[PDB]
Design an enzyme around this catalytic site. Structure first.
Site, PDB file in Angstrom:
ATOM      1  N   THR A   1      -4.226   5.203  -3.166  1.00 57.50           N
ATOM      2  CA  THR A   1      -3.639   6.522  -2.971  1.00 57.50           C
ATOM      3  C   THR A   1      -2.321   6.673  -3.714  1.00 57.50           C
ATOM      4  O   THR A   1      -1.834   7.799  -3.866  1.00 57.50           O
ATOM      5  CB  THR A   1      -3.421   6.786  -1.487  1.00 57.50           C
ATOM      6  OG1 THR A   1      -2.362   5.949  -1.014  1.00 57.50           O
ATOM      7  CG2 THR A   1      -4.684   6.474  -0.710  1.00 57.50           C
ATOM      8  N   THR A   2      -1.724   5.555  -4.135  1.00 50.47           N
ATOM      9  CA  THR A   2      -0.583   5.578  -5.041  1.00 50.47           C
ATOM     10  C   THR A   2      -0.927   6.285  -6.346  1.00 50.47           C
ATOM     11  O   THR A   2      -0.129   7.074  -6.869  1.00 50.47           O
ATOM     12  CB  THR A   2      -0.135   4.146  -5.322  1.00 50.47           C
ATOM     13  OG1 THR A   2       0.013   3.439  -4.087  1.00 50.47           O
ATOM     14  CG2 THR A   2       1.174   4.134  -6.063  1.00 50.47           C
TER      15      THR A   2
ATOM     16  N   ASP B   1       0.828  -1.197   0.000  1.00 47.41           N
ATOM     17  CA  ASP B   1       0.000   0.000   0.000  1.00 47.41           C
ATOM     18  C   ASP B   1       0.864   1.250   0.000  1.00 47.41           C
ATOM     19  O   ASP B   1       1.751   1.406   0.846  1.00 47.41           O
ATOM     20  CB  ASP B   1      -0.932   0.007   1.203  1.00 47.41           C
ATOM     21  CG  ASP B   1      -1.721   1.287   1.298  1.00 47.41           C
ATOM     22  OD1 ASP B   1      -2.604   1.511   0.444  1.00 47.41           O
ATOM     23  OD2 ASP B   1      -1.458   2.067   2.233  1.00 47.41           O
TER      24      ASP B   1
ATOM     25  N   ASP C   1     -10.709  -0.789   3.454  1.00 48.42           N
ATOM     26  CA  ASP C   1     -10.987  -0.368   2.090  1.00 48.42           C
ATOM     27  C   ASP C   1     -12.258  -1.004   1.561  1.00 48.42           C
ATOM     28  O   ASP C   1     -12.950  -0.394   0.747  1.00 48.42           O
ATOM     29  CB  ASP C   1      -9.812  -0.708   1.182  1.00 48.42           C
ATOM     30  CG  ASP C   1      -8.625   0.188   1.421  1.00 48.42           C
ATOM     31  OD1 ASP C   1      -8.828   1.377   1.745  1.00 48.42           O
ATOM     32  OD2 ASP C   1      -7.490  -0.295   1.265  1.00 48.42           O
TER      33      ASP C   1
END
Lengths: 499, 478, 489, 503
Positions: free
Chosen positions: D82-83, D49, D366
Site C-alpha cells: 500500500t506504500t 509496512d 498478505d
C-alpha cells in the site's frame, strides 16, 4: 482598509458579494463538473459536485448572498439539479450590467429592461419548444431508452448501459406516480462485472452485527410482513434476575403469539447471539434506516408495535415474497414484493468501489432524465443551444428597439453566454473557439447546434436526443431574472445592532 | 590564527579542484569591471595567477605552485589540491589534540616512503631503451591534457623525437620555438627554422642572402651639431658596408633614411623582435646582442650562414632556414583564437620539458591515479608498523593520496566513492599494474592501456606537496 | 557548485525568455526603459540583445550567441537564444534528478550530431546552376519589406554578381567578396548597377584630365604638415612629379590639411585625382583591389607602387553622380556590388540592408547547398526522431537526449503562440500530422494556420537551422560545464 | 489580505500530497528503510509496512486525510504494498503538475491517466507469464513466502515459518470460495520465545487460569462447557445454599445437558470445583468473552455460551492431543487441543519481538491474499519493478498512435511508474537513475519481462531465479486504485475549509 456603504458602493459591494458566492459554485456546472471538498470542521470530509449540497453545507455571511441563496434553495425543491445554473446566470447578469451602473444609469431602468428581456425570452422559448411524446416513447419505448442512453453514451460502460437504460426505463415506467429519488434507491455490491447489476422490486439491505439476526428465514412465503418495533430485544440482587428471565420469556412468547416474521427496530440485535435470537424462533432486524422504514411500510406495509406481546394485523400481512440471498456473496435483507410498490431498488453488482460514485453521478440524473422525458414532452435541446438562440433573439431585440434598454438587453444577451462557456471550461476545451464556431453556424445554419461534452466540438444536441425540459428552463431563467432584479433593487442595508 | 591559514589554503586548493584531470570543468575569471567581459579556462595554473589572493598564508601555497609552474609546466593544480587536502586532513588531527610538529615529522617520514615506493615501480620506456615511439607519445599526449591540439600532436612528438638527435645537448629547451596566426585549425603546424619577420627594403629586396653576420644597431648653433650627429650615424652606415653582412637585428626604432641606407649596403635590419626569439638568434643562429656596435668592425659581430625570408599563405610566413646550428625547429600553426598563442607554447614547454626529463631519465609510472593509490598503500603499511601518535599522522597522509584519484573520478562525472574504494581494495592484492581509467570510467590494467606519467613530475608533485604542507602547518600566527 | 550552476541556468533562461515572444515575423516589439533613455521599439531581438544591460556572465554568453549566429548565417538570431534557454531550462530536471553535468554535456553532443545528420538528409539540394531557387529564396527573404518593389531591382543583380565570380571560398561558396560595393545619396533606386572594379563615391573635381587609359595609382597617405615643412611639402610634390600619377588617393592620417594650394596647384599642373578621408575599413580592401602598396612613407615609393588601371573617370554616372569608377587593376573590386543610389534615406539604408540579407542567404545556400521547409517543422521533426533515438539509447543519456527533444519544441509553440493559436494543442496536432504524414507540415505564420508549408512557400536554407542548433548546443554545453566564478584579478 | 484558490490551489495540494509520498517513498521495497512509530502518549515501535505508517500517523492537510482514507480502503483489497499506491500518487501528481505547466486542464490529465491505466492493466495481462497451476504448489510456496520474509533473518527459520505459511494456506483452503473470513483469524503470538517455537499448533492456548492450580490437566473428553452464568451468616448461609444449589442445579442441569468443563466468565468459589475435582471433572472461573468461536471450531462447532444449548454435538471443542508446558515461567495455559480439526484455524507463534509478531500476522494475511490469489485468480507477475518498466514501455508505445493532447498524459503516466523501480533502487543503496535505465535498455534488447531491480543484491536482475513474485490482482488493484484517487485529487480544487474564518 476599504469602507463601502454609500449607494453606488452598496450595489458594488452587493455584486462583489454575489460574484464570490458564484465562484463558490462556478466549477460544479455540468455533468463532469469539478468536485469541491468541504468539511464540517471536525473531520467530516464531504466531496460534492452538486450545488445545493454544497450550498447548504457552505457558509454564507453576506446580505445579498443570503438573498440570492434563498432562490438557490427554492430551485432545488423542484428537481434538485440546476441550482448552479440559475445562480451563475444571475451573477453573469449582474456582472454584465455592472459597467452601466457606475457610469450613471438607474437601477429601476435596468430592472425593467431585465424584466422585458425575460418576457421576450420566455415568449421565444415557447415557440421553439418541440414535443416528442408519440414518437414511440412509452409504446415501442426504445427512443425513450435512447435518451436513457444519453447518460453514459459511447463509453466502455455503454454496453452495460444498454441494460442500465432498459432497467432505468423500467425503474420509471413500472412506478410512475410522479416518481422521486426516494422511491428508487441504488445499492452497491462489490465483486463481479458491471453487467451483472440488477433492479429488484423491493428493498435491499446488507446485514451487519447490529442489523439483522439469522438466515434460513421464510423466503418463499406467501405474505411475509414486518413488525416495526421501538423496544429492544436483548438480555434486590436476587429480585432483579428473575424479572429479566421472565422478560426474556415473554419477549420470546411475543414472537409466537404476534406471529411476526421479521421484527424491525432502531435498536441493536445480537449477532454474537445469532442462534440465541434465532431462539426468538423467527427472524428479526434492528438499527433500521429511514428508507427501509418507509419502503417497507408505505410500500410493503409492516405495522408498528408498542408493548410486550404487541400483536397487529400487518406483521404477516400482504406482501409478495421474502428473500435473503448471497448477492455478490454477501447475504442481504430483502422485504421485496411490495403491494404498494413505489419501491424498485438498483443493485449495483460490480467490481470497483468508486464506480458507486460513477453511477450516483451518471444514473442519479438518468432516473431524472427518463422520468422527466416521460413527465415532460414539450422539451428543447441542451448544451447551451437554448441560451444561444435566446441570446441571438435578444441581440436582435436590443438593436431593433430605440432607447437606453438597447444596451441592457444586449447585456441581458451576452450574460447568457457563460452557460456553455462554463460548461466547456468544466469539460476542458477552449471556450473561445467552441463559442465562436458555435455562434457562426448558429447565426447562419440553425438553432440547436450545441456544445458536445464528449468530443468538445459543436454538434446537434437535438439529434443526439439531449432533451432539456422547456418548463424547467422557463423557471430557471425566470428565477435568474428575479434574483437579478432583487439584488439590483437593493441599495441600503440597515444594520441596527445589539451594541 | 592557525585555522584561517588552513581555510585560506583550502580555498586556493578548491579553486583548482574542479579543474583537476582531463575532464575538468572550466571556471570564470571575471575581474575588474572595466573590460572583464569573460574568461573560461580549464587550466588551473592561470586561475591562481589571476586570483587576487587575500590571506598571506594562501600566498605561500600560491608561490609553491609557482615554483611547481616553472619547473615542469603542468602540475600546479595537483600540488595545490594535494597540499590543501593535506591541510584539511591535518586540521582534523589538530582538533584531536595532536601537536603540529608531530604531524610535520609524520609528513616527512611518510613522504620518504612515498618517494621510494615510486622508485619500486620505476618502469622505463623503450624510446630511450629500444628507440620506440608511441610509449613517449603517451606521456606527450597526457601532458597535452585539457587542450585541443591532437591532430598535430604527432608533430609535437616529432619535435620530441627529433630533439633526441638534433635539439638535445643536455635536453635543450632553447632550440624549441612556437608562433601562430589566426584563421584555420589544428592542421596548420609544420617545421620552421625561426621567427616570422620579413625583408623590408621592399619589392627590391631579394629572398636568398649569402651570409648573415648579425648583431644589434644603435640608432639613426644646435642644428649644426644635430647635423654632426647625422654625420656620425652616417659614418656608421659607411662602416657597415665594409663588413659584408646580410642581416642585422634592429632593436631600436629606425626610419627610412637609416633603413634604405642599410639595405642598399646589403644590411637587413630586423626591427626589435621579442628577446626570447633573439635568444635563438644569439646562438642557434649565432648572432649575439649588444647595445653599441662601434667596436665590432670585422671580427666581433654575430656568426651565421644562411637566413631566408619567404611569404606563404596570408602570414608573414618567413622560414629562417640555413642557420649555423640548425636546431630552431619552429612550430607555426594558424590557430583559431588568441588563447592558443600561449597555450601551444606553454603546452609544448610542459610536454617537451618532461620529455627532456625522459631523455635524461625515461622512467615512468602508470598515471590515472594508481600511483597515488600505491603511495597511499605504502604509507598505510608503514602506519601499521610504528607506534606513537605519528602513526596517526601517516594515516591522513594516506587519505590525501586517496583524494587525488577520487577528484579525477569526480570531475569525470562518474561515481567516485565505489571504484576508488574498489581500486584501493584491489591494489592490495591485484598488484600495481591495475588502476583507474577515467575515459571509460572503470578499473583496468594501466600498463596495458598505456596511461602513464613521467616519474620526474610525480616525484616533483609528491615531494613539493608535503614541502608546502610542512611550511604552512608549522606557521600558527599572523 | 550546484548553487552557482543553477544561477547560471536561471540567468540564461531569463535572458532567453526576455526575447522569446519576439520569435517569428509575428513576434511583438519590445519597450523597456532601462539604461539612460533607451526606447526599444523593434520586433527583432538581435538589437534587443545588443542593448541588454547584462551583468551575469552566462547571460552574456547568450548575447554572444546572437552575434555568432549573425556572423555565421545572419538568420535565426533569436532562435539560437530560445533553443539555448529551453535546453538550459530542461537541464534543471536532469540536475535535480541526479545526472552529473558532464554526462548531460556529452549526451547533448550526441543528440546534436544525431540531429544534424537527421536534418541534413531530410532536405532538398539546390544547385549553383539553378538560379531560380536563388529568386525563390529572394522572394522568401528580399520581399515582405519596402524593397518588395525593389526585389526585381536588386535580387538578380546580386545573383549575377555571384554568376560573375563564383568565388573559391569555403568550398567555392559565396564570401563577402564578389566585386566591390558602394552607396550614394541622391538619385533613384533603379540607378543601381553591377560594377566591374573599384568605385569611389567621394567627391573629386578636376578641371584637368583624370581620365587616362594607363592611369597609375599611388597610395600616398601622407597629407601636408605645417612648419621647414613647407619645403617638405615642396619635396613631396617633387616626388609626385617624378611619379607621374594621376589617380592617387590621398589620406588625412598625419594632419588635417591634405593638399594645400602650394601642393594643390602643383598637383593640378599635372592634374591628379584628389579625394580625401578614404573610409578606413574600405582602405585595406582598396589596397587588396588595386595593388599599390599601403605606404604613407613618401620615400618608400617605388616603381612597383604603380597601381594599375584601365579606365578611371570622375564620371557623372546616372547623369549627375560624379563617381570615380576604376577597372583593370590586379584584383579589381573586393566586396559585393549593389550601388545603393536613391533620393530618400530609407531607400539608401534598407536597399543596402536587404542586399546584405540577400548576401547572407545566398552564401547560406552554397556553403550548405540544401534547403528545408521552415516554420517550426524541422524542430518538430527533430523532437520526434531524437525521442525515438533516446528510446533506443541506453544509460543516463536516455533522458538527456529526450531532454534534448522536448526543448526543441519551443520554436513551433512560440510560433503557435505568436500566431494566436493555442500552442500546446497545435504542437500536438503538428506532431501527430508529421508522424503519419510528412516532414514539411508546419505553422504558416504568413497566413496563420497549420498546413503544409512547402505548398505555402515559407522555407529556409538548411545551414541557418544547423548553425543555430550547433551554436546553441555548444553554448549550452559550456554553460553546463561552467561551475565556478571568481572575481578580483 | 490573502485567498488561495484556482490552479494555485492545485499546485499547493500536490506539493502537500507528494510530501506525504516523499515520506513513504523511502519505505518501498524489502530493503526499504523501515521506520519508527511514536504516539502522542509516548509509546515507541518500529514498522516497515506503510499502511500502519499512514494509519497511525496524524496528518494536518485534508488531501493527506483523503489519501489515508482511500489507502485504508486498499488494505482490505491487498494490504501488501500500500506504500506504492502513495508513491504512485505523488508520482502522477508531480507529472500532472508538469502537464499543468503547459496548460492542460486537469480533467484531461485525469482521464488521460485513466486511458493510460487502461493501457497498463491490459498490458499487465499481456506480460502475464503467470503459472496458473499453483494449487498443489507446496514447493514453490517456499519461494512465495520467502520474499515476504526477506528483510530479516526469518529466512533462516523459513524452513519453519514458510512451511507454517503453506500449512496455514492449506488448512484455510476452501477450494471453491477461497477466502479468509472473520472467523479464520490466524494468530496466537506468544510474546517471548525464539525462532522455531513459532510452530505448528492448530489450537487454542489463551492466558486464562486453571480450574484448580494443581489439577491434572488431562481433559481428553470433548464434554466441555462455556458459560453465560455469572454470580448474578444468614446472608452467606443463603448464598452458600445458593452455591451448593448452583452445584446441584447448574451442574445437574449440565448432567441433564452435557456442559462439563464449566469455564465460567465471572465469580465463583473453587471449592465446588474442588468437589468436582474429587468427582473428577474440571471447571474454570473467570474466563474471557469472545473466544467461544475459536474454542468451539476445534472440532467444527460454533459459539455455545448457553446454559441449555450446549449439547453433545455443540460442545466446547478441542483440537489435537498434545501436552507441552505453555507457561514455562508463566502460568501454564489451557490445553483446548484434544479431539478434531479446526476450520477457523489459528497458529502457534512464540515471537519475542513485536516486529516478528507484526509481520507474521500481517504478511501471513498478505499470503492469505496472494495465495488466495493462487486460488481466487492464480495470476502472478514478476515484481521488483520489472512489471513497472514493462508496463511503462507499452504505455509510451501507446502514447504514439493516439492523436490527442491526452497523449501527453500517457507519457507523463509511464515515467511516474518509473518512480517504483527508482525507489526500489534508491532504498537499496544504488544509483537510482542508471540502474533502472540499464534494466530498461536490457529489456528493450531482450524481450524477457522478468528483468527487474536487484533489491536482494543477488546474482542478476532476472526475477525468475530469485522469485520476486507479486500477484496480478495485487498489481492491478494497486495501479487502478492509484489512478482512481489521482483522478479524485485532480477533480478537487477548492478546499473551502470550515471554521477557518475566511476574511
Amino acid at each position: 482598509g476599504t469602507d463601502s456603504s454609500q449607494g453606488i458602493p452598496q450595489l458594488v459591494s452587493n455584486i462583489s458579494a454575489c460574484q464570490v458566492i458564484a465562484e463558490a459554485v462556478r466549477t460544479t456546472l455540468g455533468p463532469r463538473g469539478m468536485d469541491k471538498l468541504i468539511v464540517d470542521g471536525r473531520g467530516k470530509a464531504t466531496i460534492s459536485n452538486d450545488g445545493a449540497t454544497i450550498l447548504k453545507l457552505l457558509d454564507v455571511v453576506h446580505p445579498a448572498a443570503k438573498t440570492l441563496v434563498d432562490i438557490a434553495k427554492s430551485q432545488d425543491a423542484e428537481v434538485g439539479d440546476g441550482t448552479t445554473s440559475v445562480t451563475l446566470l444571475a451573477a453573469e447578469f449582474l456582472k454584465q450590467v455592472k459597467p452601466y451602473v457606475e457610469e450613471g444609469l438607474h437601477p429601476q431602468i435596468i430592472i425593467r429592461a431585465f424584466r422585458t428581456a425575460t418576457q421576450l425570452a420566455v415568449n421565444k422559448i415557447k415557440e421553439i419548444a418541440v414535443t416528442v411524446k408519440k414518437a414511440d416513447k412509452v409504446e415501442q419505448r426504445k427512443l425513450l431508452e435512447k435518451c436513457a442512453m444519453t447518460a453514459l453514451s459511447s463509453k466502455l460502460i455503454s454496453q452495460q448501459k444498454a441494460f442500465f437504460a432498459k432497467m432505468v426505463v423500467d425503474a420509471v415506467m413500472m412506478l410512475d406516480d410522479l416518481l422521486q429519488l426516494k422511491m428508487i434507491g441504488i445499492k452497491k455490491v462489490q465483486g463481479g462485472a458491471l453487467e451483472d447489476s440488477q433492479l429488484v422490486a423491493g428493498v435491499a439491505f446488507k446485514k451487519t452485527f447490529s442489523y439483522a439476526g439469522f438466515e434460513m428465514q421464510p423466503k418463499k412465503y406467501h405474505n411475509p410482513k414486518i413488525a416495526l418495533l421501538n423496544v429492544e430485544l436483548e438480555l434486590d440482587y436476587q429480585a432483579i434476575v428473575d424479572a429479566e428471565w421472565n422478560i426474556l420469556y415473554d419477549k420470546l412468547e411475543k414472537i409466537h403469539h404476534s406471529g411476526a416474521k421479521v421484527v424491525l427496530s432502531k435498536l441493536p440485535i445480537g449477532d454474537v447471539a445469532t442462534q440465541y435470537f434465532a431462539d426468538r424462533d423467527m427472524f428479526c432486524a434492528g438499527r433500521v434506516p429511514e428508507e427501509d422504514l418507509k419502503r417497507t411500510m408505505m410500500a410493503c406495509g409492516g405495522s408498528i408495535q408498542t408493548s410486550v406481546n404487541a400483536l397487529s394485523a400487518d406483521v404477516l400481512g400482504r406482501c409478495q415474497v421474502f428473500e435473503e440471498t448471497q448477492i455478490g456473496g454477501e447475504r442481504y435483507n430483502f422485504f421485496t414484493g411490495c403491494p404498494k410498490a413505489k419501491t424498485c431498488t438498483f443493485i449495483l453488482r460490480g467490481g470497483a468501489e468508486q464506480f458507486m460514485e460513477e453511477t450516483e453521478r451518471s444514473l442519479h440524473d438518468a432516473i431524472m432524465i427518463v422520468r422527466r422525458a416521460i413527465k415532460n414532452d414539450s422539451v428543447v435541446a441542451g448544451g447551451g443551444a437554448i441560451e444561444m438562440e435566446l441570446s441571438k433573439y435578444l441581440r436582435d431585440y436590443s438593436r431593433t428597439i430605440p432607447g437606453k434598454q438597447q444596451l441592457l438587453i444586449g447585456a441581458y444577451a451576452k450574460a447568457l453566454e457563460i452557460i456553455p462557456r462554463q460548461l466547456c471550461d468544466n469539460a476542458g476545451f477552449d471556450a473561445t473557439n467552441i463559442l465562436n464556431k458555435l455562434r457562426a453556424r448558429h447565426a447562419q445554419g440553425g438553432t440547436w447546434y450545441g456544445v458536445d461534452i464528449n468530443n468538445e466540438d459543436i454538434a446537434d444536441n437535438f439529434e443526439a436526443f439531449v432533451w432539456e425540459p422547456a418548463m424547467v428552463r422557463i423557471n430557471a431563467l425566470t428565477a435568474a431574472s428575479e434574483a437579478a432584479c432583487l439584488i439590483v433593487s437593493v441599495d441600503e442595508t440597515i444594520k441596527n445592532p445589539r451594541s | 590564527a592557525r585555522l584561517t591559514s588552513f581555510i585560506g589554503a583550502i580555498a586556493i586548493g578548491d579553486l583548482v579542484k574542479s579543474t583537476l584531470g582531463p575532464k575538468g570543468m572550466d571556471k570564470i575569471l571575471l575581474s575588474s569591471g572595466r573590460d572583464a567581459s569573460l574568461m573560461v579556462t580549464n587550466d588551473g595554473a592561470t586561475i591562481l595567477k589571476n586570483i587576487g589572493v587575500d590571506n598571506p598564508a594562501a600566498k605561500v601555497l600560491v608561490d609553491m605552485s609557482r615554483v611547481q609552474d616553472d619547473e615542469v609546466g603542468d602540475g600546479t593544480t595537483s600540488v595545490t589540491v594535494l597540499a590543501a587536502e593535506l591541510l584539511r586532513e591535518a586540521e582534523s588531527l589538530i582538533a584531536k589534540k595532536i601537536h603540529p610538529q608531530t604531524i610535520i615529522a609524520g609528513w616527512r617520514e611518510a613522504t620518504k616512503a612515498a618517494r621510494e615506493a615510486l622508485l619500486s615501480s620505476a618502469v622505463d620506456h623503450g624510446s630511450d631503451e629500444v628507440k620506440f615511439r608511441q610509449d613517449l607519445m603517451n606521456i606527450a599526449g597526457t601532458t597535452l591534457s585539457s587542450k585541443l591540439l591532437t591532430h598535430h600532436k604527432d608533430h609535437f612528438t616529432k619535435l620530441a623525437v627529433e630533439a633526441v638527435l638534433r635539439l638535445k645537448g643536455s635536453g635543450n629547451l632553447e632550440a624549441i620555438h612556437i608562433i601562430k596566426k589566426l584563421g584555420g585549425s589544428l592542421a596548420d603546424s609544420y617545421l620552421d627554422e625561426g621567427f616570422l619577420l620579413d625583408k623590408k627594403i621592399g619589392v627590391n629586396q631579394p629572398k636568398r642572402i649569402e651570409n648573415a653576420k648579425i648583431l644589434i644597431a644603435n640608432t639613426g648653433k644646435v642644428a649644426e651639431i644635430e647635423h654632426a650627429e647625422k654625420e656620425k650615424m652616417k659614418e656608421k652606415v659607411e662602416r657597415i658596408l665594409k663588413h659584408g653582412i646580410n642581416c642585422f637585428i634592429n632593436r631600436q626604432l629606425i626610419y627610412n633614411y637609416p633603413e634604405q641606407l642599410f639595405g642598399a649596403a646589403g644590411v637587413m635590419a630586423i626591427e626589435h623582435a621579442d628577446f626570447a626569439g633573439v635568444e635563438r638568434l644569439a646562438l642557434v643562429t649565432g648572432g649575439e646582442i649588444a647595445s653599441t656596435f662601434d667596436h665590432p668592425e670585422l671580427v666581433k659581430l654575430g656568426s651565421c650562414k644562411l637566413i631566408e625570408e619567404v611569404m606563404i599563405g596570408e602570414d608573414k610566413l618567413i622560414h629562417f632556414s640555413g642557420v649555423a646550428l640548425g636546431e630552431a625547429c619552429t612550430i607555426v600553426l594558424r590557430g583559431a583564437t588568441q588563447q592558443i598563442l600561449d597555450e601551444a607554447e606553454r603546452s609544448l614547454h610542459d610536454a617537451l620539458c618532461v620529455l627532456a626529463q625522459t631523455v635524461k631519465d625515461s622512467r615512468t609510472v602508470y598515471g590515472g591515479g594508481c600511483s597515488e593509490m600505491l603511495m597511499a598503500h605504502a604509507v598505510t603499511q608503514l602506519a601499521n608498523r610504528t607506534p606513537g601518535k605519528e602513526a596517526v599522522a601517516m594515516e591522513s597522509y594516506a587519505k590525501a593520496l586517496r583524494m587525488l584519484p577520487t577528484i579525477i573520478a569526480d570531475n569525470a562525472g562518474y561515481d567516485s566513492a565505489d571504484l576508488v574504494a574498489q581500486l584501493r581494495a584491489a591494489h592490495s592484492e591485484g598488484n600495481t599494474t591495475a588502476g583507474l581509467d577515467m575515459r571509460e570510467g572503470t578499473i583496468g590494467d594501466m600498463a596495458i592501456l598505456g596511461i602513464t606519467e613521467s616519474f620526474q613530475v610525480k616525484r616533483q608533485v609528491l615531494l613539493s606537496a608535503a614541502e608546502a604542507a610542512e611550511v604552512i602547518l608549522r606557521v600558527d600566527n599572523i | 557548485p550546484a548553487q552557482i550552476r543553477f544561477s547560471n541556468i536561471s540567468a540564461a533562461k531569463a535572458v532567453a525568455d526576455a526575447i522569446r515572444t519576439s520569435l517569428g515575423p509575428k513576434g511583438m516589439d519590445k519597450m523597456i526603459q532601462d539604461g539612460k533613455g533607451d526606447v526599444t521599439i523593434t520586433n527583432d531581438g538581435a538589437t534587443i540583445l545588443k542593448q541588454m544591460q547584462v551583468l551575469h556572465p552566462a547571460a552574456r554568453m547568450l548575447v554572444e550567441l546572437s552575434k555568432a549566429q549573425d556572423i555565421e548565417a545572419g538568420d535565426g538570431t533569436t532562435s539560437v537564444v530560445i533553443i539555448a534557454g529551453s535546453l538550459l531550462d530542461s537541464c534543471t530536471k536532469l540536475l535535480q534528478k541526479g545526472i552529473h553535468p558532464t554526462i548531460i554535456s556529452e549526451s547533448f553532443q550526441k543528440a546534436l550530431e544525431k540531429g544534424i545528420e537527421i536534418l541534413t538528409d531530410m532536405s532538398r539540394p539546390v544547385e549553383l546552376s539553378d538560379r531560380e531557387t536563388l529568386l525563390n529564396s529572394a522572394t522568401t527573404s528580399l520581399n515582405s519589406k519596402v524593397v518588395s518593389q525593389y526585389s526585381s531591382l536588386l535580387s538578380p543583380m546580386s545573383v549575377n554578381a555571384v554568376m560573375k565570380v563564383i568565388d573559391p571560398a569555403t568550398a567555392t561558396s559565396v564570401d563577402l567578396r564578389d566585386i566591390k560595393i558602394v552607396k550614394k545619396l541622391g538619385g533613384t533606386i533603379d540607378d543601381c548597377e553591377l560594377v566591374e572594379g573599384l568605385v569611389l563615391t567621394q567627391k573629386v573635381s578636376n578641371s584637368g584630365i583624370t581620365r587616362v587609359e594607363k592611369a597609375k595609382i599611388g597610395l600616398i597617405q601622407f597629407c601636408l604638415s605645417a612648419p621647414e615643412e613647407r619645403a617638405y611639402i615642396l619635396n613631396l610634390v617633387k616626388q609626385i612629379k617624378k611619379t607621374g600619377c594621376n589617380v592617387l588617393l590621398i589620406q588625412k592620417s598625419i594632419l588635417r590639411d591634405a593638399l594645400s594650394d602650394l601642393a594643390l596647384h602643383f598637383l593640378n599642373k599635372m592634374k591628379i585625382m584628389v579625394i580625401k578621408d578614404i573610409e578606413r575599413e574600405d582602405i585595406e580592401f582598396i589596397c587588396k583591389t588595386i595593388g599599390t602598396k599601403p605606404v604613407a612613407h613618401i620615400d618608400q615609393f617605388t616603381a612597383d607602387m604603380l597601381g594599375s588601371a584601365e579606365l578611371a573617370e570622375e564620371v557623372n554616372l546616372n547623369g549627375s553622380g560624379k563617381l570615380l569608377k576604376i577597372t583593370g587593376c590586379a584584383s579589381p573590386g573586393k566586396t559585393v556590388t549593389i550601388v545603393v543610389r536613391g533620393s530618400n534615406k530609407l531607400v539608401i539604408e534598407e536597399a543596402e540592408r536587404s542586399i546584405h540579407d540577400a548576401l547572407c542567404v545566398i552564401r547560406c545556400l552554397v556553403k550548405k547547398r540544401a534547403l528545408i521547409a521552415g516554420g517550426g517543422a524541422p524542430e518538430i521533426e527533430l523532437a520526434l526522431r531524437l525521442t525515438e533515438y533516446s528510446r533506443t539509447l541506453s544509460g543516463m543519456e536516455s533522458y538527456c537526449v529526450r531532454a534534448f527533444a522536448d526543448a526543441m519544441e519551443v520554436i513551433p509553440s512560440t510560433l503557435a503562440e505568436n500566431a494566436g493559436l493555442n500552442p500546446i494543442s497545435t504542437v500536438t496536432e503538428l506532431r501527430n500530422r508529421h508522424a503519419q504524414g510528412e516532414k514539411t507540415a508546419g505553422i504558416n505564420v504568413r497566413k496563420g494556420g497549420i498546413s503544409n508549408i512547402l505548398e505555402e512557400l515559407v522555407v529556409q536554407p538548411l545551414l541557418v537551422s544547423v548553425s543555430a542548433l550547433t551554436l546553441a548546443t555548444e553554448t549550452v554545453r559550456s554553460i553546463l560545464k561552467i561551475d565556478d566564478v571568481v572575481n578580483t584579478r | 489580505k490573502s485567498r488561495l484558490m484556482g490552479l494555485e490551489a492545485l499546485k499547493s495540494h500536490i506539493m502537500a500530497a507528494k510530501a506525504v509520498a516523499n515520506t513513504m517513498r523511502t519505505s518501498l521495497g524489502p530493503n526499504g528503510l523501515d521506520k519508527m512509530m511514536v504516539d502522542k502518549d509516548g509509546d515507541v515501535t518500529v514498522t516497515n509496512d506503510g499502511a500502519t505508517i499512514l494509519s497511525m500517523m496524524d496528518v494536518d492537510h485534508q488531501i493527506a486525510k483523503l489519501m489515508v482514507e482511500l489507502s485504508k480502503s486498499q488494505d482490505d483489497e491487498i494490504g501488501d504494498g500500500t506504500t506504492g499506491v502513495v508513491v504512485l500518487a505523488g508520482a502522477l501528481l508531480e507529472e500532472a503538475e508538469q502537464l499543468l505547466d503547459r496548460g492542460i486542464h486537469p480533467i484531461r490529465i485525469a482521464d488521460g491517466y485513466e486511458q493510460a491505466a487502461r493501457v497498463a492493466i491490459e498490458h499487465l495481462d499481456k506480460i502475464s507469464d503467470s503459472v496458473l497451476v499453483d494449487i498443489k504448489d507446496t514447493e514453490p510456496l517456499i519461494q512465495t513466502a520467502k520474499t515476504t520474509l526477506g528483510s530479516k533473518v526469518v529466512n533462516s527459520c523459513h524452513r519453519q515459518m514458510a512451511e507454517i505459511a503453506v500449512n496455514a494456506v492449506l488448512t484455510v483452503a476452501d477450494m471453491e470460495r477461497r477466502d479468509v473470513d472473520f472467523e479464520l483469524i490466524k494468530v496466537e503470538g506468544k510474546v517471548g520465545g525464539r525462532l522455531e517455537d513459532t510452530k505448528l499448533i492448530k489450537g487454542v492456548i489463551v492466558d486464562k487460569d486453571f480450574s484448580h492450580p494443581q489439577m491434572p490437566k488431562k481433559v481428553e473428553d470433548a464434554k466441555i462447557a462455556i458459560l453465560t452464568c455469572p454470580f448474578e451468616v444468614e446472608d452467606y448461609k443463603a448464598l452458600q445454599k445458593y452455591e451448593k444449589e448452583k452445584f446441584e442445579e447448574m451442574i445437574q442441569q449440565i448432567k441433564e445437558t452435557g456442559a462439563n468443563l464449566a469455564i465460567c466468565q465471572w465469580g465463583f468459589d473453587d471449592e465446588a470445583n474442588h468437589l468436582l475435582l474429587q468427582n473428577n471433572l474440571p471447571a474454570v472461573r473467570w474466563v474471557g468473552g469472545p473466544e467461544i468461536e475459536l474454542i468451539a471450531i476445534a472440532t467444527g462447532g460454533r459459539i455455545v455460551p448457553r446454559f441449555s444449548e450446549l449439547t453433545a454435538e455443540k460442545l466446547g471443542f478441542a483440537g489435537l492431543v498434545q501436552e507441552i508446558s505453555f507457561g514455562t515461567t508463566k502460568d501454564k495455559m489451557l490445553v483446548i487441543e484434544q479431539c478434531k480439526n479446526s476450520r477457523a484455524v489459528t497458529i502457534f507463534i512464540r515471537g519475542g519481538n513485536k516486529m516478528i509478531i507484526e509481520e507474521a500476522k500481517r504478511s501471513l494475511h498478505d499470503a492469505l491474499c496472494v495465495i488466495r490469489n493462487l486460488i481466487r485468480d492464480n495470476r502472478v507477475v514478476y515484481g521488483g519493478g520489472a512489471a513497472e518498466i514493462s508496463c511503462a514501455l507499452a504505455v509510451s508505445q501507446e502514447a504514439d498512435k493516439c492523436p490527442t493532447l491526452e497523449q501527453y498524459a500517457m507519457r507523463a503516466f509511464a515515467d511516474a511508474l518509473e518512480v517504483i523501480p527508482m525507489a526500489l533502487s534508491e532504498n537499496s543503496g544504488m544509483n537510482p537513475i542508471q540502474t533502472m535505465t540499464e534494466v530498461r535498455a536490457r529489456q528493450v534488447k531482450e524481450m524477457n519481462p522478468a528483468l527487474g531491480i536487484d533489491c536482494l543484491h543477488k546474482g542478476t536482475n532476472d526475477m525468475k531465479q530469485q522469485h520476486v513474485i507479486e500477484t496480478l490482482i495485487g498489481k492491478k488493484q494497486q495501479i487502478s486504485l492509484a489512478t482512481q484517487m489521482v483522478r479524485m485529487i485532480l477533480k478537487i480544487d477548492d478546499i473551502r475549509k470550515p471554521g477557518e474564518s475566511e476574511e
